Design a protein around this nucleic acid. Structure first.
Ligand SMILES: Nc1nc2c(ncn2[C@H]2C[C@H](O)[C@@H](COP(=O)(O)OP(=O)(O)C(F)(F)P(=O)(O)O)O2)c(=O)[nH]1
Ligand SMILES: [Cl-]
Ligand SMILES: [Cl-]
Ligand SMILES: [Cl-]
Ligand SMILES: [Cl-]
Ligand SMILES: [Mg+2]
Ligand code: NA
Ligand code: NA
Ligand code: NA
Length: 326
DNA sequence: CCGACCGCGCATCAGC
DNA sequence: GCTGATGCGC
DNA sequence: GTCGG
């Protein structure tokens, strides 16, 4: 929060480009700037000072001067005054409603929460759940609750099969004192890059968690990726906990490190690392790290036995989870 | 300049 | 039914 | 919107 004013501005600008302009590269350009500045250990005094940092160009330097000088940005002031922009930005806050759907709904006259509610018929399954838990999904999850949730998930998983290994990643693994959701990496010895000796591996876990009333809804579900809703159990007479978003990813056992790396994030950290990888002649995905042949085509997976091996391949000093929050 | 911007699972759709 | 592109999200 | 070659 040392430069909280500036970073909030950039993020607001990032959201505008993504949601309203549908300019994904401008979106990421603003995010990178916000990130590098959030990490800057000095209270910024000028755009020029800011331009020294990588990711901050001329355009953003100018905006920072305006912000430092007036405490606001006219460009944003107008965006906030624009009804269409405001409506699209809001609608995209519903899980399942993206830039396209948001703009389309506004085109039909659906611009508010009230509107969405009386038009459920026009929403797909995911969007319907996103609306239902609109309020809840906006709430943060205290680490204390993340710990209780972890306990439930690991123990329930263990009940299904002692050989499953469930790892909580995302901001939680990065040591965050609060998280936006719960991210679970799952592995079973019967599922490897070599073969799938047992079907319904993810299903079983999902089913067990639904049985105990932990998982309450499903946004989407496939063979290796579950995306849904969960809720901690409340005691007698106490208000129940808010519903939380939960993602579960089943990854081949032998590809755990690339998997835990990917799911630990952050998303921006992953983008930076994968980009750096390319520059170093490698391509990284949640399964493997492969070299780039002279042609520019990925080669065979390289041997990995720790998160650090991945960092070594691209000549990056290892960075603990707590330091990957970009 | 100007091309590149990480990589991929699931839901949905049009076209065959 | 299938494949492929697109939307959305992680 | 920003970067490198
Ligand atoms: N290669 C990519 N990896 C991505 C991307 N988005 C998410 N991820 C990865 C890294 C997250 O930690 C992880 C979980 O995705 P999530 O959105 O939950 O992020 P995080 O948990 O880090 C969080 F934003 F901090 P939260 O508010 O939930 O506490 O998924 C992406 O665009 N590319
Ligand atoms: Cl763009
Ligand atoms: Cl402003
Ligand atoms: Cl691996
Ligand atoms: Cl791969
Ligand atoms: Mg998360
Ligand atoms: Na710069
Ligand atoms: Na959304
Ligand atoms: Na998540």
């Amino acid at each position: 929060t040392l430069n909280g004013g500036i970073t909030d501005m950039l993020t607001e600008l990032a959201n505008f480009e993504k949601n309203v302009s549908q300019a994904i590269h401008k979106y990421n350009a603003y995010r990178k700037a916000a990130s590098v500045i959030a990490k800057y250990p000095h209270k910024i005094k000028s755009g020029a000072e800011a331009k020294k940092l990588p990711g901050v160009g001329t355009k953003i330097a100018e905006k920072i001067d305006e912000f430092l000088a007036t405490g606001k940005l006219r460009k944003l002031e107008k965006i906030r005054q624009d009804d269409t922009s405001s409506s699209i930005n809001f609608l995209t806050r519903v899980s399942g409603i993206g830039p396209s759907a948001a703009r389309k709904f506004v085109d039909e006259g659906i611009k508010t929460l009230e509107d969405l509610r009386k038009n459920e018929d026009k929403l797909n399954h995911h969007q319907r759940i996103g609306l239902k838990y609109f309020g809840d999904f906006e709430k943060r999850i205290p680490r204390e609750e993340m710990l209780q949730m972890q306990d439930i998930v690991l123990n329930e998983v263990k009940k299904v099969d002692s050989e499953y290994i469930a790892t909580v990643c995302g901001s939680f693994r990065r040591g965050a004192e609060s998280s936006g959701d719960m991210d679970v990496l799952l592995t079973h010895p019967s599922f490897t890059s070599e073969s799938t000796k047992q079907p319904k591996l993810l299903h079983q876990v999902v089913e067990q968690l639904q049985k105990v009333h932990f998982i309450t809804d499903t946004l989407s579900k496939g063979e290796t990726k579950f995306m849904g809703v969960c809720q901690l159990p409340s005691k007698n007479d106490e208000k129940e906990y808010p519903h939380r978003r939960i993602d579960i990813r089943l990854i081949p056992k032998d590809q755990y490190y690339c998997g835990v790396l990917y799911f630990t994030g952050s998303d921006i950290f992953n983008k930076n690392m994968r980009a750096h990888a390319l520059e170093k002649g490698f391509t990284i995905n949640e399964y493997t790290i492969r070299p780039l042949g002279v042609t520019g085509v990925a080669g065979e997976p390289l041997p990995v036995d720790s998160e650090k091996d991945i960092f070594d391949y691209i000549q990056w000093k290892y960075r603990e989870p707590k330091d990957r929050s970009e």
